[PDB]
């Protein structure tokens, strides 16, 4: 089939989309870990 | 076509994606503790 070759193409493609949002949320999390350590070092 | 060792890999990749979300959720529960403890001292 040509449809089953494109459904897997779209499934694999969005498995990449879910992967890179988790990567981009980790960068944001590490900045929150940094902003807490810097603000804690003040008090 | 013979998507056997392709689907069975998507499943395992969808598992580690789930575990990375569960570990970030723990990490986020560690950050909220810090902001509510930094607020308690203000």
């Amino acid at each position: 089939t040509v449809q089953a070759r494109q459904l897997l193409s779209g499934i694999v493609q969005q498995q990449n989309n879910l992967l890179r949002a988790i990567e981009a949320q980790q960068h944001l999390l590490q900045l929150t870990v940094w902003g807490i350590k810097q603000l804690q070092a003040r008090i | 076509v013979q998507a056997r060792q392709l689907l069975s890999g998507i499943v395992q990749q969808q598992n580690n994606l789930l575990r990375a979300i569960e570990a970030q959720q723990h990490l986020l529960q560690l950050t909220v503790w810090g902001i509510k403890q930094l607020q308690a001292r203000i």
Binding site: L19 | L6, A23, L27
Partner: peptide
């Protein structure tokens, strides 16, 4: 919990999130 333990759990969860992402990338290239 103390910040000395807070730091311990942060660098323990972070090192495994990076490890899980390491696995997810090696599985993404298929």
């Amino acid at each position: 919990m103390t910040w000395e333990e807070w730091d311990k759990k942060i660098e323990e969860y972070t090192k495994k999130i990076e490890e899980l992402i390491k696995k997810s990338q090696n599985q993404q290239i298929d």
